[PDB]
Amino acid sequence: MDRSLRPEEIEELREAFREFDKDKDGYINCRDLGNCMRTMGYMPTEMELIELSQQINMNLGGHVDFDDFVELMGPKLLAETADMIGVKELRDAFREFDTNGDGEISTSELREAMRALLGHQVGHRDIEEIIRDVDLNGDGRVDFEEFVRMMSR
Ligand SMILES: [Ca+2]
Numbered sequence: 350m351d352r353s354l355r356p357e358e359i360e361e362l363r364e365a366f367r368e369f370d371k372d373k374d375g376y377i378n379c380r381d382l383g384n385c386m387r388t389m390g391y392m393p394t395e396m397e398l399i400e401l402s403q404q405i406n407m408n409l410g411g412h413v414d415f416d417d418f419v420e421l422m423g424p425k426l427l428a429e430t431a432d433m434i435g436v437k438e439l440r441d442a443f444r445e446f447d448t449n450g451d452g453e454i455s456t457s458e459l460r461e462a463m464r465a466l467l468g469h470q471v472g473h474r475d476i477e478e479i480i481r482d483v484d485l486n487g488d489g490r491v492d493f494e495e496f497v498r499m500m501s502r
C-alpha cells in the first residue's frame with residue numbers, strides 16, 4: 350500500500366467487511382460487492398467488480414478474513430479521490446492539517462501532518478518542495494482548494 354492505514358480507515362474497512370461477511374454465502378455477487386465498497390467510500394468500475402469477485406469467488410474460493418479484506422480493499426480506500434470523499438470529510442481532513450485553525454496550512458503544519466501520515470519525519474527540502482507543487486497562489490500557504498487539488502487527478 351501507498352501508506353499505512355489510519356485507525357479511522359481501519360474502522361470503515363471493519364464496517365465494510367461486516368457487511369461483506371453478512372452478505373456472503375459461498376460467493377459474493379457484484380451488487381453486494383459494490384455496495385460493501387461504497388460503505389468505505391469507494392466508487393468502483395464494473396471491471397474492478399468483475400476482477401475482485403473473480404479473486405474472492407475463484408482465487409480465494411470465497412474464503413476471506415478481515416486481513417484478506419484489508420489487503421484487497423486497503424489500496425482502494427487509499428485511492429479515493431476528492432470526488433468520492435465529499436466536502437464534509439475533505440474539510441475535516443483539512444482541519445486536522447490546519448491545526449491553528451487559521452484556514453491555511455503552513456509548512457510546519459504540513460510537515461507535522463505528513464509525519465503523521467507516513468509514520469516517519471519528512472525532510473525540510475521535501476516540504477518546502479511539496480509546498481511549491483501545491484501552492485497555486487504563491488502565498489507560501491495551502492488553502493482548502495489547494496488541499497483538495499492535492500488529492501484530485
Ligand atoms: Ca494554519
Ligand SMILES: [Ca+2]
Nearest residue numbers: 484486490491
Ligand atoms: Ca496558497
